[PDB]
A paper describes a structure:
EhpR belongs to the glyoxalase I/bleomycin resistance protein family, whose members have a wide variety of functions extending from simple binding of toxic small molecules to their chemical conversion through enzymatic activity. The EhpR monomer consists of two βαββ'β fold units (' indicating antiparallel orientation with respect to the other strands) that are typical for members of the glyoxalase I/bleomycin resistance protein family.
EhpR behaved as a homodimer during size exclusion chromatography and crystallized in space group P212121 with two and one dimers per asymmetric unit in the apo and GA-cocrystallized form, respectively. The structure was solved from single-wavelength anomalous diffraction data collected at the K-edge of seleno-L-methionine labeled protein crystallized in the apo form. These crystals diffracted to 2.15 Å and the structure was refined to a crystallographic R-factor of 20.5% with Rfree = 25.9%. While these arms are too flexible to be traced beyond G6 in the apo structure, all residues including those remaining from the N-terminal His6-tag after thrombin cleavage could be traced in the atomic resolution data set. While the apo and complex structure are otherwise highly similar (average rmsd < 0.6 Å over the complete monomer), F109* undergoes a significant conformational and positional change on ligand binding. It adopts a different rotamer and moves together with the loop from E103 to G110, which leads to the formation of an open conformation of the ligand binding site with respect to the apo structure. This movement is required to unblock the binding site and suggests that ligand binding follows a multi-step mechanism. In addition, the finding that the binding site is blocked by F109 in the apo structure indicates that the ligand needs to induce structural rearrangements.
Numbering used by the authors:
A (entry chain B): 8 to 129
B (entry chain A): 7 to 128
Write the structure that this text describes.
């Protein structure tokens, strides 16, 4: 068949990133080992964090995004409100909610500088 | 609303060449095409998108993520490699030839903007 069913990101601290994605996704990982953790994605697809590649560098620009498509533009803002209201987890804002071609969007950075974009279903 | 990472977005320099590249790699037409934004189906309702409106990628800047393709067995992985390097129409930049890593039988290639693509087995 041939599908991109594994989105894989390099992380420096597997514990801290596991805990961050657990909070972002509101889901447990389906696979945990000390250096490699996978969270469910859509269908038989996985989103994986791994310390076995190279350690991300904050000052190095990134050329991709972890996109999170929710049903509506309303789900996006009340997901930004809920994320930035809570104190317990560091949510670094890159762009507060605005309107792109697909609609209501925002951008946060994960602990290792991976860009996460939240947006409505295109 | 469930929060899934269902949009793997990559920045490309040339949407045309990238669309032709991904079309060949996936064996699949894209489902959404504009001049600056192209999406291919991934698993479930997830998408793999290429976008020229981001920061333009640079070949020699290191990358901290990978586009993973999980096939059923190690013997598909070796299979997929022979084909890709064998054919002449589409230039395929090998980063690592087939070897054993933590995923099993894997290999790595680069897309035309230096995005890293890994093929491995479920």
């Amino acid at each position: 068949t041939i599908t991109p069913n594994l989105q894989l990101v390099y992380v420096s601290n597997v514990e801290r990133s596991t805990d961050f994605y657990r909070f972002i996704f509101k889901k447990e990982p389906v696979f945990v080992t000390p250096r490699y953790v996978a969270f469910p994605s859509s269908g038989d697809a996985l989103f994986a964090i791994w310390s076995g590649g190279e350690e991300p560098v904050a000052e190095i620009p990134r050329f991709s995004e972890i996109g999170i498509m929710l049903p509506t533009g309303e789900d996006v803002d009340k997901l930004f409100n809920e994320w930035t209201k809570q104190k317990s987890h560091q949510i670094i804002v890159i762009k507060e909610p605005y309107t792109d071609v697909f609609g209501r969007t925002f951008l946060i950075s994960d602990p290792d500088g991976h860009i996460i974009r939240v947006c409505p279903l295109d």
